[PDB]
Design a protein around this ligand. Structure first.
Ligand SMILES: [Cl-]
Ligand SMILES: [Cl-]
Ligand code: NI
Length: 207
């Protein structure tokens, strides 16, 4: 399994590499600079934030996470297991999200997922353990690696917007080929695809 790649601390190297693909050379200049993501010091809490926020507005997602934070002991595995399912529903969580959050806390306290020591685990091993939790598929696991853990080399082949972007920009090309070229910077390439979509949704000119 590939060795864990550290989070980028700056994007210059990444952008130069990606820019070797004339599509991304254009996309990166059109979209400009993207902020450098710092790996979270609290993976568990970021996992819970992600889960809790799914399908909610940005303000609603913040609110509900704040209500979780306000439970006794906060957003910590052992503390969340002492909160009843009725009180987790009570903060506004769907039953699906209650179950996922309970499942993630239980996995942390049982040692099934060592949220304190992910830094050394290959992407796929982190993915496989997250996937075993109810309500968390590969896509959620991959988004967590990319956005929470700031791993640099993640292309989520189940993200519809990424796949629609590759289809649009590279018609008739094998997506595995296209995206492999972006390695070891598939995460920033992914972020530029989403940025380009936002750019187009704002009225921008196409490539
Ligand atoms: Cl909900
Ligand atoms: Cl998922
Ligand atoms: Ni390179």
């Amino acid at each position: 399994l590939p060795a864990v790649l550290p989070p980028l601390t700056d994007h210059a190297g990444a952008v130069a590499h990606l820019s070797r693909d004339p599509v991304l050379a254009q996309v990166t200049s059109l979209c400009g600079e993207l902020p450098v993501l710092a790996p979270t010091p609290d993976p568990f809490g970021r996992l819970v934030r992600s889960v809790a926020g799914q399908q909610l507005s940005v303000k609603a997602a913040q609110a509900i996470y704040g209500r979780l934070e306000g439970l006794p002991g906060g957003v910590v595995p052992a503390a969340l297991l002492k909160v009843s399912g009725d009180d987790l529903r009570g903060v506004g969580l769907s039953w699906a999200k209650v179950r996922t959050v309970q499942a993630a806390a239980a996995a942390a306290v049982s040692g099934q997922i060592d949220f304190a020591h992910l830094s050394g685990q290959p992407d796929e091993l982190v993915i496989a353990e997250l996937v075993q939790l109810p309500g968390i598929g590969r896509w959620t696991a991959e988004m967590f690696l990319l956005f929470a853990l700031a791993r640099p080399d993640v292309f989520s082949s189940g993200d519809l917007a990424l796949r629609q972007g590759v289809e649009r920009l590279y018609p008739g090309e094998d997506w595995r080929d296209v995206t492999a070229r972006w390695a070891p910077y598939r995460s920033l390439a992914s972020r530029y695809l989403w940025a380009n979509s936002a750019r187009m949704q704002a009225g921008g000119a196409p490539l």
